[PDB]
Each structure stands twice: as C-alpha cells, then as structure tokens.
A = this chain, B = another copy of it.
Amino acid sequence: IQRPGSGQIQLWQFLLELLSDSSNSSCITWEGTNGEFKMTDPDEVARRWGERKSKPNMNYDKLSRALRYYYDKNIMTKVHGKRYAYKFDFHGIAQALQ
C-alpha cells in the first residue's frame, strides 16, 4: 500500500482511491456488484493517471494495456457486455495489501 494521493501509487490503488470518493462518478464509479466498476469517462481517468504519474502521452490505450496486466496477477478482470467495466479481485487485492 502506498500513501493515498502519492505519485508512487500503483494503478490498482489509484482506481480504488478515485472510487472511494463518490464525487468522481462522472469519470469512474462503482457499478453496485461487489468490486465491479465502470469508467464513465475513460479518457478522464487516463488523464488523471497521467497527471498523478507525470507520464507524457498517457492515454486510454496505455491505461487499458496496464489493466490487462492485472488479470494475470489476479488483481482485476474485465467485465464483458458492459462499456469500460472492470472488476477487482479481492483475492489478489488482499495480497497486495501485505
């Protein structure tokens, strides 16, 4: 776990940070089913990630590629049939906290 709001934060924790504050819902919001979320403005999520990390040329293409990497790590999966929807895996997140 890194310090909330920090530049060293990992992507999984950054998305949980944005989700924890309902005022972010115009760009990213919980869906209601445990751990499932949707990027209501995926370009805005990518912009905010770019700004946190000060990474030039960050965009949704790059953000989605990073999210795909979490599947193998058991930290997240995509949700099919929905737009820009993903689901956190509690089993990998618990490990990521230690």
User: What residues of chain A have their CB less than 8 Å away from a CB belonging to chain B?
Assistant: 1, 4, 13, 16-17, 19-20, 30, 34-35, 87-91, 94-95, 97-98
Contact = CB atoms under 8 A, between A and B. Distances in A.
Contact of A89 (B13, B34, B89, B91): B34
Q: Which 9 A-B pairs have the closest CB atoms?
A: A20-B94, A35-B90, A16-B94, A4-B98, A20-B95, A1-B1, A34-B34, A34-B90, A34-B35
Contacts of A95: 20
B34 A98 contact: no
Contacts of A91: 30, 34
A18 to B, nearest CB: 10
Contacts of A34: 34-35, 87, 89-91
